[PDB]
Write a protein that binds this DNA or RNA. Structure first.
Ligand SMILES: Nc1nc2c(ncn2[C@H]2C[C@H](O)[C@@H](COP(=O)(O)NP(=O)(O)OP(=O)(O)O)O2)c(=O)[nH]1
Ligand SMILES: [Mg+2]
Ligand SMILES: [Mg+2]
Ligand code: NA
Ligand code: NA
Length: 327
DNA sequence: CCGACGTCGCATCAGC
DNA sequence: GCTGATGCGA
DNA sequence: GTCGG
C-alpha cells in the first residue's frame, strides 16, 4: 500500500521482532514477527481487527491478540514495559553496533557497559570488528546516494582492471537493482584462473590496491574468497569529508559467475521466493549452482549456466530485470 | 503434540 | 599446537 | 510465533 496504512502495527511487530532476536535470543520468534510485519505491510486495507489480520499467512492467534490491544489502546503493555527496562533496552541498542550481536550485547550490559560512551571507555573488551563498528557507528547508519555509488564503482572498476585487466568486477546488491540509494556496496570478483575445478592471491591483490589509493580504509574480515571492510570516496581540496561506507568484495569461481551475480543481486526477499518456486519445480538454487531435484528430493549435478535467464528458464519463470527484483 | 524455521565465509572461543 | 563449535553479518 | 506433518 503506502507504508503508513498499517504502519503502527508493522512498527509494533518490528520492535517485537528486535527484542526477540537481541534480548530473548529467540531467532525463530524474530522471523515470525518479521514475516507477519511483511505480509501486513503489503495488505491493501486498513486492518480493523486481529481476526481480520489473522486471515493472512504468518499471522496467528498471539499476534491477532496484540493487534486487538493496539487498536483498542494505541499501545502494547509488554512493549511499553520493556522499553523502560534499562537492561533490555540497553542490550537491544548495543546490537546496533556492527560486530556486537545478541550475545556480546548481553555480556557488555551484564558488566555495566550499556552505552556508546561505555564502549569508548572500554576498547580492551572489544574485538577488531566491534571497534570499527563503534568508530563508524553513525556513518554505517547513513545511506549512500546513487551518485556516490557510481563514483565508488568508478574507482573499483578502475583499480581492479589496473591490477589485472582480466578480472571482472560487478557491483551487485541494491545498486545493480538500480536503487536511488544503498546501505552499502557489494562487489563480485571473477578471474579466469579461479574456477570450481581450480594464481594464489587473487582477492588480496584487489584489496591491497584499493588500500593503496586510499579507497579502503579498514578491514573487518578478510579471507581468500570474502572481504568485508570500510571504504571512503576522496574529497576535494576544501570540501567536507565523505562518510565512511561498508563494502564487501567476493571472489567467485568464473564458471559460477551468474549464480553468484543472481544470488548477491537479490533482493534477499526476491531470492527467498525465487529459490522457493524452484523447490516446487524440482530444482534448487544456491549461490554456486542450480541443481535438479531427483524424485526423492535429492539434488543431482550442477547444470550449465551461461546467463542469468538460463536460471530463470529452468524454473518456469519469465526473466526479470534486476530493477524488478525488489521481491 | 511437536519439529521446522536457508545457507555461507570468517573471527573467535572451547576443549583436547 | 590442533579441531570442532559458536558468534556474527549477510 | 506460526505452520503443518
Ligand atoms: N544468504 C543471505 N543473503 C542475503 C541476506 N540478506 C541479503 N542477502 C544476499 C542478498 C542481498 O540483497 C544481498 C547483497 O547484500 P546486501 O548489501 O546486505 N543487501 P542489498 O544490497 O539488497 O541491500 P542494501 O542496499 O541495504 O545494501 O546478498 C540474507 O539474510 N541471507
Ligand atoms: Mg548492498
Ligand atoms: Mg552488503
Ligand atoms: Na493466519
Ligand atoms: Na550488531
Amino acid at each position: 500500500p503506502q507504508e503508513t496504512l498499517n504502519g503502527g502495527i508493522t512498527d509494533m511487530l518490528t520492535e517485537l521482532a528486535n527484542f526477540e532476536k537481541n534480548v530473548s535470543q529467540a531467532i525463530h520468534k524474530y522471523n515470525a514477527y518479521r514475516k507477519a510485519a511483511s505480509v501486513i505491510a503489503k495488505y491493501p486495507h486498513k486492518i480493523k481487527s486481529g481476526a481480520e489480520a489473522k486471515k493472512l499467512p504468518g499471522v496467528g492467534t498471539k499476534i491477532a491478540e496484540k493487534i486487538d490491544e493496539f487498536l483498542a489502546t494505541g499501545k502494547l503493555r509488554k512493549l511499553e514495559k520493556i522499553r523502560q527496562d534499562d537492561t533490555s533496552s540497553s542490550i537491544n541498542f548495543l546490537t546496533r553496533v556492527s560486530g556486537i550481536g545478541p550475545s556480546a550485547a548481553r555480556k557488555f550490559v551484564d558488566e555495566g557497559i550499556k552505552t556508546l560512551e561505555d564502549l569508548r571507555k572500554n576498547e580492551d573488551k572489544l574485538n577488531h570488528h566491534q571497534r570499527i563498528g563503534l568508530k563508524y557507528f553513525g556513518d554505517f547508519e547513513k545511506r549512500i546516494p546513487r551518485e556516490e555509488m557510481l563514483q565508488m564503482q568508478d574507482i573499483v572498476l578502475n583499480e581492479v582492471k589496473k591490477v589485472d585487466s582480466e578480472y571482472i568486477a560487478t557491483v551487485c546488491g541494491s545498486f545493480r537493482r538500480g536503487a536511488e540509494s544503498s546501505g552499502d556496496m557489494d562487489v563480485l570478483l571473477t578471474h579466469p584462473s579461479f574456477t570450481s575445478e581450480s594464481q594464489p592471491k587473487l582477492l588480496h591483490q584487489v584489496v591491497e590496491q584499493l588500500q593503496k589509493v586510499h579507497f579502503i580504509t579498514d578491514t573487518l574480515s578478510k579471507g581468500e574468497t570474502k572481504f568485508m571492510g570500510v571504504c571512503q570516496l576522496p574529497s576535494k581540496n576544501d570540501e567536507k569529508e565523505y562518510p565512511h561506507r561498508r563494502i564487501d568484495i567476493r571472489l567467485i569461481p568464473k564458471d559460477q559467475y551468474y549464480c553468484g551475480v543472481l544470488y548477491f543481486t537479490g533482493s534477499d526477499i526476491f531470492n527467498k521466493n525465487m529459490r522457493a518456486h524452484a523447490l516446487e519445480k524440482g530444482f534448487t538454487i544456491n549461490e554456486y549452482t542450480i541443481r535438479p531435484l531427483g524424485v526423492t528430493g535429492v539434488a543431482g549435478e550442477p547444470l550449465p549456466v551461461d546467463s542469468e535467464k538460463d536460471i530463470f528458464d529452468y524454473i518456469q519463470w519469465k526473466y526479470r530485470e534486476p530493477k524488478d527484483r525488489s521481491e
